[PDB]
Design a protein around this ligand. Sequence first.
Ligand SMILES: *[C@@H]1O[C@H](CO)[C@@H](O[C@@H]2O[C@H](CO)[C@@H](O)[C@H](O)[C@H]2NC(C)=O)[C@H](O[C@@H]2O[C@@H](C)[C@@H](O)[C@@H](O)[C@@H]2O)[C@H]1NC(C)=O
Ligand SMILES: *[C@@H]1O[C@H](CO)[C@@H](O[C@@H]2O[C@H](CO)[C@@H](O)[C@H](O)[C@H]2NC(C)=O)[C@H](O[C@@H]2O[C@@H](C)[C@@H](O)[C@@H](O)[C@@H]2O)[C@H]1NC(C)=O
Ligand SMILES: *[C@@H]1O[C@H](CO)[C@@H](O[C@@H]2O[C@H](CO)[C@@H](O)[C@H](O)[C@H]2NC(C)=O)[C@H](O[C@@H]2O[C@@H](C)[C@@H](O)[C@@H](O)[C@@H]2O)[C@H]1NC(C)=O
Ligand SMILES: *[C@@H]1O[C@H](CO)[C@@H](O[C@@H]2O[C@H](CO)[C@@H](O)[C@H](O)[C@H]2NC(C)=O)[C@H](O[C@@H]2O[C@@H](C)[C@@H](O)[C@@H](O)[C@@H]2O)[C@H]1NC(C)=O
Ligand SMILES: *[C@@H]1O[C@H](CO)[C@@H](O)[C@H](O)[C@H]1NC(C)=O
Ligand SMILES: *[C@@H]1O[C@H](CO)[C@@H](O)[C@H](O)[C@H]1NC(C)=O
Ligand SMILES: *[C@@H]1O[C@H](CO)[C@@H](O)[C@H](O)[C@H]1NC(C)=O
Ligand SMILES: *[C@@H]1O[C@H](CO)[C@@H](O)[C@H](O)[C@H]1NC(C)=O
Ligand SMILES: *[C@@H]1O[C@H](CO)[C@@H](O)[C@H](O)[C@H]1NC(C)=O
Ligand SMILES: *[C@@H]1O[C@H](CO)[C@@H](O)[C@H](O)[C@H]1NC(C)=O
Ligand SMILES: *[C@@H]1O[C@H](CO)[C@@H](O)[C@H](O)[C@H]1NC(C)=O
Ligand SMILES: *[C@@H]1O[C@H](CO)[C@@H](O)[C@H](O)[C@H]1NC(C)=O
Ligand SMILES: *[C@@H]1O[C@H](CO)[C@@H](O)[C@H](O)[C@H]1NC(C)=O
Ligand SMILES: *[C@@H]1O[C@H](CO)[C@@H](O)[C@H](O)[C@H]1NC(C)=O
Ligand SMILES: [Cl-]
Ligand SMILES: [Fe+3]
Ligand SMILES: [Fe+3]
Ligand SMILES: [Fe+3]
Ligand SMILES: [Fe+3]
Ligand code: NA
Ligand code: NA
Ligand SMILES: [Zn+2]
Ligand SMILES: [Zn+2]
Ligand SMILES: [Zn+2]
Ligand SMILES: [Zn+2]
Lengths: 424, 423, 425, 423
Amino acid sequence: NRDMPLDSDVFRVPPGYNAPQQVHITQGDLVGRAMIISWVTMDEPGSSAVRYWSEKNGRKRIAKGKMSTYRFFNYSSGFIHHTTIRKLKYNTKYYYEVGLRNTTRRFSFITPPQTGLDVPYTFGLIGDLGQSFDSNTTLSHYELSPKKGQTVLFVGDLSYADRYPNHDNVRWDTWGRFTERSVAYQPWIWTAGNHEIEFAPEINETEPFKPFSYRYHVPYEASQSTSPFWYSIKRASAHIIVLSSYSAYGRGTPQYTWLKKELRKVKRSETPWLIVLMHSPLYNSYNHHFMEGEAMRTKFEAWFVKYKVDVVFAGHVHAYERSERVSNIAYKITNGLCTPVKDQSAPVYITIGDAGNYGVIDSNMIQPQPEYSAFREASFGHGMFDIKNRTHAHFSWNRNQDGVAVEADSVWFFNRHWYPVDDS
Amino acid sequence: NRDMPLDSDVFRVPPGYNAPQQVHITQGDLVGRAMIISWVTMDEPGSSAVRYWSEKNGRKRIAKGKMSTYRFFNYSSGFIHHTTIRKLKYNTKYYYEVGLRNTTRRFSFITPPQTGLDVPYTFGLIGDLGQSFDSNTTLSHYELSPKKGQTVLFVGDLSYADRYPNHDNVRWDTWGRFTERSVAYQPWIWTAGNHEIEFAPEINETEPFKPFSYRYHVPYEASQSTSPFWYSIKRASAHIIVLSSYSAYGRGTPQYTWLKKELRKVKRSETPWLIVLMHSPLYNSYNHHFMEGEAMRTKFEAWFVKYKVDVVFAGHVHAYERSERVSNIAYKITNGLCTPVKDQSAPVYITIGDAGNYGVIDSNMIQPQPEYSAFREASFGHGMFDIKNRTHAHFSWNRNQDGVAVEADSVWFFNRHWYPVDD
Amino acid sequence: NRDMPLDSDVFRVPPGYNAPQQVHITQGDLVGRAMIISWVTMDEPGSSAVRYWSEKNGRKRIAKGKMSTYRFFNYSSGFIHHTTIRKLKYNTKYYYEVGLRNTTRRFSFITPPQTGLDVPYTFGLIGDLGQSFDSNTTLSHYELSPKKGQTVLFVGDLSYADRYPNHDNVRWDTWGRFTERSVAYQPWIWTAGNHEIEFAPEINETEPFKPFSYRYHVPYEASQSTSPFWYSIKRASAHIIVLSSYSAYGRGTPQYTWLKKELRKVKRSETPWLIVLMHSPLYNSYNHHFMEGEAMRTKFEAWFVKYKVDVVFAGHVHAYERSERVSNIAYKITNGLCTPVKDQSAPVYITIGDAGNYGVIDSNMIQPQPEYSAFREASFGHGMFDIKNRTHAHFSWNRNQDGVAVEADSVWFFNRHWYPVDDST
Amino acid sequence: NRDMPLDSDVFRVPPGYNAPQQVHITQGDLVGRAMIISWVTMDEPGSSAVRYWSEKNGRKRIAKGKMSTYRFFNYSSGFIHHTTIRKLKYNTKYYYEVGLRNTTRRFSFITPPQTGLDVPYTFGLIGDLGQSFDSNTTLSHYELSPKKGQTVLFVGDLSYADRYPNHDNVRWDTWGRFTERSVAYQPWIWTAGNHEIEFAPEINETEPFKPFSYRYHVPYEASQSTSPFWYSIKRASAHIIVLSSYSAYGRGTPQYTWLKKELRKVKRSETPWLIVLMHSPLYNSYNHHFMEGEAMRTKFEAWFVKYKVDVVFAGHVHAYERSERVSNIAYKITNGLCTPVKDQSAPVYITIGDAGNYGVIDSNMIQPQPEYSAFREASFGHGMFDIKNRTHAHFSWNRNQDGVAVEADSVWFFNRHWYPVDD
Ligand SMILES: *[C@@H]1O[C@H](CO)[C@@H](O[C@@H]2O[C@H](CO)[C@@H](O)[C@H](O)[C@H]2NC(C)=O)[C@H](O[C@@H]2O[C@@H](C)[C@@H](O)[C@@H](O)[C@@H]2O)[C@H]1NC(C)=O
Ligand SMILES: *[C@@H]1O[C@H](CO)[C@@H](O[C@@H]2O[C@H](CO)[C@@H](O)[C@H](O)[C@H]2NC(C)=O)[C@H](O[C@@H]2O[C@@H](C)[C@@H](O)[C@@H](O)[C@@H]2O)[C@H]1NC(C)=O
Ligand SMILES: *[C@@H]1O[C@H](CO)[C@@H](O[C@@H]2O[C@H](CO)[C@@H](O)[C@H](O)[C@H]2NC(C)=O)[C@H](O[C@@H]2O[C@@H](C)[C@@H](O)[C@@H](O)[C@@H]2O)[C@H]1NC(C)=O
Ligand SMILES: *[C@@H]1O[C@H](CO)[C@@H](O[C@@H]2O[C@H](CO)[C@@H](O)[C@H](O)[C@H]2NC(C)=O)[C@H](O[C@@H]2O[C@@H](C)[C@@H](O)[C@@H](O)[C@@H]2O)[C@H]1NC(C)=O
Ligand SMILES: *[C@@H]1O[C@H](CO)[C@@H](O)[C@H](O)[C@H]1NC(C)=O
Ligand SMILES: *[C@@H]1O[C@H](CO)[C@@H](O)[C@H](O)[C@H]1NC(C)=O
Ligand SMILES: *[C@@H]1O[C@H](CO)[C@@H](O)[C@H](O)[C@H]1NC(C)=O
Ligand SMILES: *[C@@H]1O[C@H](CO)[C@@H](O)[C@H](O)[C@H]1NC(C)=O
Ligand SMILES: *[C@@H]1O[C@H](CO)[C@@H](O)[C@H](O)[C@H]1NC(C)=O
Ligand SMILES: *[C@@H]1O[C@H](CO)[C@@H](O)[C@H](O)[C@H]1NC(C)=O
Ligand SMILES: *[C@@H]1O[C@H](CO)[C@@H](O)[C@H](O)[C@H]1NC(C)=O
Ligand SMILES: *[C@@H]1O[C@H](CO)[C@@H](O)[C@H](O)[C@H]1NC(C)=O
Ligand SMILES: *[C@@H]1O[C@H](CO)[C@@H](O)[C@H](O)[C@H]1NC(C)=O
Ligand SMILES: *[C@@H]1O[C@H](CO)[C@@H](O)[C@H](O)[C@H]1NC(C)=O
Ligand SMILES: [Cl-]
Ligand SMILES: [Fe+3]
Ligand SMILES: [Fe+3]
Ligand SMILES: [Fe+3]
Ligand SMILES: [Fe+3]
Ligand code: NA
Ligand code: NA
Ligand SMILES: [Zn+2]
Ligand SMILES: [Zn+2]
Ligand SMILES: [Zn+2]
Ligand SMILES: [Zn+2]
């Protein structure tokens, strides 16, 4: 176990009575004019109000949100606040304060630009963060990146609190305080991983995702989803679809039905970059969780080809892997066509679940490297998906053992819709 | 299309003030000593009490249940009752009556024999019933069967009420009154199909399986399931595992985790017949819904082989198919091994979703007939799985266009644990 | 049984698919800038959106509210909509529309003037309305009154649906359609009466006021009440306090606590007319329900004197009665001081529970008329509290058997804070 | 504030992992064959099962109950268990054990005799107990009483936790542990006082009686009450009626309606002693809370007289008072009949809210002592209602300053139905 001890500086509780902690934000709407503000108070319920103001207009406003609590076995939570700030200005720095009654803590964010064809934007890519010492340097590598991530795409497995006895939910609080130094100033877009399931019938905890869902809200109604575990957002030139690997996705189910309709609503003339997130990779040549993505892949892979998804990000495997553009959609049971082929309409599949978890890397690879795998390496690190314009985005991967400006893997993406050419 | 009109005889309301209607029973425990009695009253809530007594020891006892209601868009249900009778005697006729506060109605059932290695038992197989005129013929054929079925293994898609505007839930009620003449007297073991999902955010109805789960209860806690849409029961010599094609089944999910534990609890020296029910077939050589079952197959086929499941029954496809014993579990992305192969540890996959639905048959088939497919036909009908003992179970398929004693398809199942020979 | 039959013209369903019916409004805030819009759709849920605009300007805005439903025994409601229009302009005609998805119906209201010392306003007084032919006559008299009532103060007992078998809640829907012609255009201020309680444990209905509270919302949180059945509103120059005779009011209970603080908040220099609404009369010389008000009188009478309430309106008794300014607050169990005395600091107690109910008047009164009873008469009718300014309000009582313009009883009120001179007739 | 400090011995936590604390029992049915067993586990949910057996026959049985939790402002409760043991034998000592899964604790109780005309029984009377050092003394005097109480009638105001900042509900847990040494072995019959209202809108606690209602269950369903704050039990020769001073009692309200019908069910030929419990006294000659009972009095006094209630116990005033048998029911507003008069159908009204509370006594009395007041004294203490038979019960008031066998006041109650003479 390489988890940071409870006394670590990154887990420190902010001073002052009922001081807000575990502050975290995410996009609150479909197009970027809104922000969910989230924090926890531990001494008393406190106010769910958020004071905020833009640098441009300097008028202090109040939004009012809602508080909630939960229990998990013998654990009882602090007071969890979720407040949505709406009708924000584009491309604008706002300041926001939480804890208006007790002790007040102040933060800030920048709204993205209005969606558009050539609007540039830099996405962090982080998966399977955890709270090990490895997790802490990955976060450091992200925040010190000269490419300056503006939003993190998070592909599942947050706190790993379920590894503890009875899923010791204090390790959710520590994770929230630890990640605050980033997510309180820029949105993370949440994907549900398997360590969020927390299905523990032995301790009478049988509602999947219960802790995760109380602590991390997503703007899922903004895209007509009926569940927080699959949803869409638009931000700058990107359309991002979040799927749930451990929800139902059979034909006719809510997630299947929502994805079918959502892929049809995508307007590549406004958001050229089509990004999909799921926890479990559909392409993966590591031994760890080899072929667990087969189920979802059979259901959705053809749809990713059809709609010319640019890239699919996943975690789950604790390592890094970048596919070639391939598909394996010709199979008809008896026709023998079960080998992935090069398909220039396919997305690139990237496994980036290597941000540290609890300190274990997945090293065992199937050998030789299969044709469908382009690059892979068992190192800790994080990714950046730097969109330049409608045709070009630059993806890079940074290792924890390198300098923060070093790119150990690096490739240009040519947009599938606006410039379809062999970017290999 | 061919759905029976609302004024059909099969849909008649039982007379009397608040007379119970849509009466139906199913196994109430793990081993067959309990029964869930269910019904609906339309005039007022009424009593959830059930009076019962055996034709033998004859003492009249009272079980008490719970009532509940639901709404669906602009539909308001009647008052739905579910009551469990426990501690029944094995292998005895009981009488039970419902509607004690006002109009009483009386029915009977016969508890199964205790579970055991060599206990014979006869299972009706019905899928995708619906309420078309074909639906009624299938049910007649089952009731007039010389085989004499004792329990219906129902592989999902019940009322087809979702085909109607706003899913007109009156068509649940009619289907309940139509099927009463069978399921009030012998258990139907319920599987959930895609027509039970009734996901309709356009009318703000977003809870999967809501009308079905209010109306049809299952003993799912008896097998430590956390959900009614997957569960297991034992009856005579059969261990029946019911799965939910339209719930989560990824690694670490409730259903995945439950099934993974459940197969370890199977004792073939106590129940040698291992039967799996699911709505969507894992092997299906018809064009309609072709390869829909692939996702669940990747997850569960290797377990079915590991545990030598005798048969997997499914509906969904509106036709009849019986596979060979095959598996397709050796694939590894790049090893190229993606062809089903004869495997005597594997189950036979039977598609039996041809009870009538709303009158339509699935006739277009993959050509040529793949080697994994033993027999297929686009006719309405039903199946019977007739366990003779620990080694032999006779499966027969009866067509609606045939006489009720006629088996258009017939095959001996040799038990995968006690007698695993080529069948 | 003088209840109007089900096929009466007043119970007619508004035509068109899923047309909104039982449209009714009431004040939706403390000061008058808000309105709660309420209505029922029978065919499908429909939209809880309200389109509205000022006759002056004309900008057509939308307010979104919520739909709820209930069951009561073997009855199932339609789809009940409550939507609050906020931030409105004072003294201004607004039009509003409901049923925006399918069949639209349009109505209007006038927001009250801004609260102030001399702001005039006419309040109607109706209690125990019911749905009888007498009930129809009272409503007609109210709306045809030459002094135009601008808001109804309603002292409880609405539909008398609970008199029917299984409280046949269909009789709630008919009463909503019948009263629509008034309450859809001007707010009625709701008090909960004993016929709202609907405690029917024999048919497993044990939640008091369940039908009433689903159908009739009030802005109780605006006055920091925690319950719909007691709350305060301010309108024009009146501060109106609504109490619940059939809720707890023992010392330390929520209603007791709320009323205690609420009287401290009243400012007679911003709203001179202090009005109390309750169902059960504290002072009542009628035989029916004689002394049922003693328990609440015991708890609150002295507070009404202390804070110089101008008038207490009640119903419950199916007749009309106006009291002298009278108090009975000096009793100490053993001191013999149990008789009401003239007290110019006390309010007037008015029983106005004679709008019709199910067609029965309460005529058996105690004789001779006690010294505390000013005027009493067993006839169907309604009242008007016509505030002229900070010092003067005219109260009048109109009988059904009389013309619409004739006051059978009437009296000038001298405001207890601004003109505290004896005004005894 | 004479409240005991948190490290006092009476607040000791039972040792051992998840040891049940705050164990307390009350009658679980109408007549005395059932017991509600309540306790709190702090380390994890634990099992709600209760193992119990009579000292007579060691046939160990299991009763299964229910667990609940609550929050109050920034306080989070432990795991609260309520389990009803039903179908017990009369007049029988039972053992019971809680904390089965982890640390077990064992207690006992003795069921009352079957209800009956001439069954003797001793009732402890305790009100406004709290947790001062005075409170601990009163509880000692009760448990040391030579008259040996068999059940406590508790007229309300339990923990006084609502005097602490934010009603510091730890002072509920501490009170449960302190009272356990009595109430784990014999029932206390709970009346809600005003310190149970805990209506605190400032800190967003607006639901009356929430902490109390979670921690202390009552068998209110057994008398067809729809609310735990009013209810009746029958025990030995007593029919006991608990009213809620701080709920609704206007005409038509649930409580009012309930009391009207419950009195009609009283059978003095089976329970000759008719006893009413309420928190706020209807007769009180103390300055503190003078005439707060008038409102309930105007509604209910004539009913008490009409049904010849033997005695009404209240608390609320932190002193002792015993009235004469008087009524004040002749008043008609204008007839001037407002003075209480002696009335041999009226109950005796006893204020017994002097068990200690937070260490304050109410000493200021109305002078001179009114005619309706028989005896009254501002001292801490408790009472005992000792039923001998259908005609006689002995009531005694024991002060904390006297020795445990000393009665500072004592009267014979002559049964209003069987023996109504001037007592
Ligand atoms: C969209 O972004 C691309 C990456 O930044 C642009 O390509 C870049 O163009 C630069 C000239 O402005 C040149 O120095 C860079 O080397 C080049 N980078 C790459 C990776 O090609 C692209 O510009 C167009 O496409 C390239 C290939 C050249 O033909 C440019 O002259 C073109 O303008 C950007 N597209 C647009 C429309 O600006
Ligand atoms: C289990 O049931 C099978 C079907 O009823 C039995 O096989 C049948 O046995 C009949 C005589 O008992 C024979 O006429 C049938 O032809 C035969 N049916 C088939 C499909 O083979 C079976 O009986 C045992 O197995 C058969 C093959 C013979 O060897 C019998 O002598 C055996 O008793 C039943 N198994 C047992 C263990 O009884
Ligand atoms: C406040 O309203 C009162 C009721 O309308 C006014 O009294 C009425 O004044 C009328 C002409 O102003 C007069 O014809 C009415 O007889 C009289 N009504 C009564 C019941 O007295 C009152 O006007 C002031 O007071 C009265 C007594 C007259 O002296 C008026 O001339 C006064 O202006 C209104 N108060 C004010 C300040 O206007
Ligand atoms: C009910 O209990 C009372 C208290 O014990 C009985 O009165 C007591 O009877 C004793 C004789 O056994 C006697 O020594 C006690 O002094 C006397 N105590 C009092 C306070 O009176 C009572 O006994 C009957 O009633 C009284 C009025 C006498 O007439 C006795 O002689 C009677 O036996 C008991 N009543 C019954 C019906 O048992
Ligand atoms: C985590 O990293 C930050 C930034 O590099 C550093 O200040 C902090 O001390 C580190 N803490 C631990 C426990 O590694
Ligand atoms: C609740 O708040 C009080 C005062 O703010 C504090 O002293 C106490 O420790 C808190 N209790 C809990 C359980 O947080
Ligand atoms: C359904 O089948 C039964 C039995 O064959 C028959 O009596 C009945 O008339 C049929 N009803 C319809 C509508 O086909
Ligand atoms: C409810 O029950 C009453 C009494 O039998 C009956 O008259 C009425 O029609 C019923 N209403 C409904 C909607 O079932
Ligand atoms: C239904 O049964 C109850 C209880 O026996 C009875 O009171 C009632 O009148 C019955 N209803 C009808 C319509 O017969
Ligand atoms: C539900 O709506 C349809 C029209 O959309 C109507 O025909 C049907 O009768 C409605 N059902 C009820 C119970 O109102
Ligand atoms: C009600 O309106 C909706 C949307 O405008 C429409 O789809 C529906 O057909 C309408 N219903 C009827 C009965 O006209
Ligand atoms: C009710 O009164 C109105 C007049 O205001 C009249 O038009 C209508 O016919 C009356 N209806 C009944 C049933 O009395
Ligand atoms: C939960 O149970 C474990 C069991 O060892 C214990 O150590 C832990 O302190 C408990 N947590 C709480 C908050 O009681
Ligand atoms: C309470 O009383 C008991 C018995 O008299 C005694 O043993 C105990 O120490 C006392 N505790 C306190 C804190 O007074
Ligand atoms: Cl009181
Ligand atoms: Fe992981
Ligand atoms: Fe089907
Ligand atoms: Fe009335
Ligand atoms: Fe007290
Ligand atoms: Na599927
Ligand atoms: Na998976
Ligand atoms: Zn994972
Ligand atoms: Zn299907
Ligand atoms: Zn009334
Ligand atoms: Zn008290």
